[PDB]
Design an enzyme around this catalytic site. Structure first.
Site, PDB file in Angstrom:
ATOM      1  N   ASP A   1       0.702  -1.006  -0.044  1.00 51.23           N
ATOM      2  CA  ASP A   1      -0.056   0.009  -0.316  1.00 51.23           C
ATOM      3  C   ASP A   1       1.173   1.224   0.186  1.00 51.23           C
ATOM      4  O   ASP A   1       1.555   2.481   0.914  1.00 51.23           O
ATOM      5  CB  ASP A   1      -1.100   0.217   1.529  1.00 51.23           C
ATOM      6  N   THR A   2       1.245   2.315  -1.307  1.00 56.88           N
ATOM      7  CA  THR A   2       1.965   2.997  -1.488  1.00 56.88           C
ATOM      8  C   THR A   2       1.425   4.614  -0.639  1.00 56.88           C
ATOM      9  O   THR A   2       1.429   5.609  -0.357  1.00 56.88           O
ATOM     10  CB  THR A   2       1.956   3.519  -2.696  1.00 56.88           C
ATOM     11  N   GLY A   3      -0.106   4.486  -0.897  1.00 56.87           N
ATOM     12  CA  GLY A   3      -0.959   5.322   0.156  1.00 56.87           C
ATOM     13  C   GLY A   3      -0.964   5.660   2.075  1.00 56.87           C
ATOM     14  O   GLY A   3      -1.577   5.991   2.569  1.00 56.87           O
TER      15      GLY A   3
HETATM   16  C1  LIG Z   1      -4.461   8.759   4.109  1.00 57.96           C
HETATM   17  C2  LIG Z   1      -4.535   8.290   2.946  1.00 57.96           C
HETATM   18  C3  LIG Z   1      -5.622   6.945   2.907  1.00 57.96           C
HETATM   19  C4  LIG Z   1      -6.834   6.734   3.072  1.00 57.96           C
HETATM   20  C5  LIG Z   1      -4.365   6.313   4.125  1.00 57.96           C
HETATM   21  N1  LIG Z   1      -5.065   4.439   4.053  1.00 57.96           N
HETATM   22  C6  LIG Z   1      -4.459   3.403   3.199  1.00 57.96           C
HETATM   23  C7  LIG Z   1      -5.452   3.361   2.255  1.00 57.96           C
HETATM   24  O1  LIG Z   1      -4.734   2.174   0.642  1.00 57.96           O
HETATM   25  C8  LIG Z   1      -6.143   2.041   2.181  1.00 57.96           C
HETATM   26  C9  LIG Z   1      -6.124   0.992   2.859  1.00 57.96           C
HETATM   27  C10 LIG Z   1      -7.417  -0.124   3.250  1.00 57.96           C
HETATM   28  C11 LIG Z   1      -7.837  -0.450   2.523  1.00 57.96           C
HETATM   29  C12 LIG Z   1      -9.124  -1.397   2.173  1.00 57.96           C
HETATM   30  C13 LIG Z   1      -9.611  -1.394   3.861  1.00 57.96           C
HETATM   31  C14 LIG Z   1      -8.803   0.056   4.717  1.00 57.96           C
HETATM   32  C15 LIG Z   1      -7.886   0.351   4.478  1.00 57.96           C
HETATM   33  N2  LIG Z   1      -7.321   2.172   1.420  1.00 57.96           N
HETATM   34  C16 LIG Z   1      -8.172   3.449   1.594  1.00 57.96           C
HETATM   35  O2  LIG Z   1      -9.447   3.691   2.876  1.00 57.96           O
HETATM   36  O3  LIG Z   1      -9.234   2.852   0.447  1.00 57.96           O
HETATM   37  C17 LIG Z   1     -10.782   3.491   0.022  1.00 57.96           C
HETATM   38  C18 LIG Z   1     -11.225   3.658  -0.772  1.00 57.96           C
HETATM   39  O4  LIG Z   1     -11.233   2.555  -2.082  1.00 57.96           O
HETATM   40  C19 LIG Z   1     -12.057   1.777  -0.955  1.00 57.96           C
HETATM   41  O5  LIG Z   1     -11.330   0.472  -1.333  1.00 57.96           O
HETATM   42  C20 LIG Z   1     -10.401   0.300   0.138  1.00 57.96           C
HETATM   43  C21 LIG Z   1     -10.961   0.995   0.969  1.00 57.96           C
HETATM   44  C22 LIG Z   1     -11.751   2.125   0.337  1.00 57.96           C
HETATM   45  S1  LIG Z   1      -5.221   3.816   5.641  1.00 57.96           S
HETATM   46  O6  LIG Z   1      -5.587   3.069   5.532  1.00 57.96           O
HETATM   47  O7  LIG Z   1      -6.075   4.997   6.239  1.00 57.96           O
HETATM   48  C23 LIG Z   1      -3.445   4.483   6.915  1.00 57.96           C
HETATM   49  C24 LIG Z   1      -3.301   5.163   7.893  1.00 57.96           C
HETATM   50  C25 LIG Z   1      -2.651   5.794   8.055  1.00 57.96           C
HETATM   51  C26 LIG Z   1      -1.374   4.608   7.633  1.00 57.96           C
HETATM   52  N3  LIG Z   1       0.211   4.370   8.361  1.00 57.96           N
HETATM   53  C27 LIG Z   1      -1.936   3.030   7.460  1.00 57.96           C
HETATM   54  C28 LIG Z   1      -2.848   2.718   6.466  1.00 57.96           C
END
Ligand SMILES: CC[C@H](C)CN(C[C@@H](O)[C@H](Cc1ccccc1)NC(=O)O[C@H]1CO[C@H]2OCC[C@H]21)S(=O)(=O)c1ccc(N)cc1
EC number: 3.4.23.16
Lengths: 99, 99
Positions: free
Chosen positions: B25-27
């Site tokens: 996860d690059t995010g």
């Molecule tokens: C602030 C940037 C971003 C939102 C941060 N997130 C990583 C992100 O990749 C999450 C990672 C993630 C994936 C799945 C469930 C929860 C989190 N993805 C996410 O929220 O995606 C949403 C948009 O498309 C949908 O698909 C997945 C959930 C929805 S995170 O999970 O909240 C996150 C925040 C801080 C850290 N250290 C690690 C992770």
């Protein structure tokens, strides 16, 4: 380009003639942008992240130029902490992970 | 390897016993893993994403193998719905975004 991960992979996107910074987010299925005005019909939707669920507005078939690469796809607008470009559009611009 | 983004970029990781599936996860700035009882000192922290914040335990210098690649660093542990390999460890296994 090749983008390394010692810093957040932030890039400039062009959407509706506006320039914004967005995060290339391989952990996101969907593309979610902070509150903004987009034209056309939208549908109320809900999505879940790490902290729970939010309400978003779903806009279909929206052009976005991501770092010079054209995508046309679904964009969700709502209370995301930051603009994120998710897999629906990363695939369109030919983005992969490599190691 | 090269991982396309048609599907969630899930890979096998190892942390002690316990092989788990985790998102590259690059995010995510930092790695966050689903609840597990790791040995050692830790510090409380809150991380925010879509939906709000969750509380996590920050462990330092935890060895993790990611697709056979060795990594060691900070691992956050808390009630995430998915195991997330964040940038702190992605750089360690040589991972880049390419398009
Ligand atoms: C602030 C940037 C971003 C939102 C941060 N997130 C990583 C992100 O990749 C999450 C990672 C993630 C994936 C799945 C469930 C929860 C989190 N993805 C996410 O929220 O995606 C949403 C948009 O498309 C949908 O698909 C997945 C959930 C929805 S995170 O999970 O909240 C996150 C925040 C801080 C850290 N250290 C690690 C992770």
């Amino acid at each position: 380009p090749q983008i390394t991960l010692w810093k957040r992979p932030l890039v400039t996107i062009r959407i509706g003639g506006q320039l914004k910074e967005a995060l290339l987010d391989t952990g996101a299925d969907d593309t979610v942008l902070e509150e903004m005005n987009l034209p056309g019909k939208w549908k109320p939707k809900m999505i879940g992240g790490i902290g729970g669920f939010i309400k978003v507005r779903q806009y279909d078939q929206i052009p976005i130029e991501i770092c010079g690469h054209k995508a046309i796809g679904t964009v969700l607008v709502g209370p995301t902490p930051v603009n994120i470009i998710g897999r629906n559009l990363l695939t369109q611009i030919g983005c992969t992970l490599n190691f």
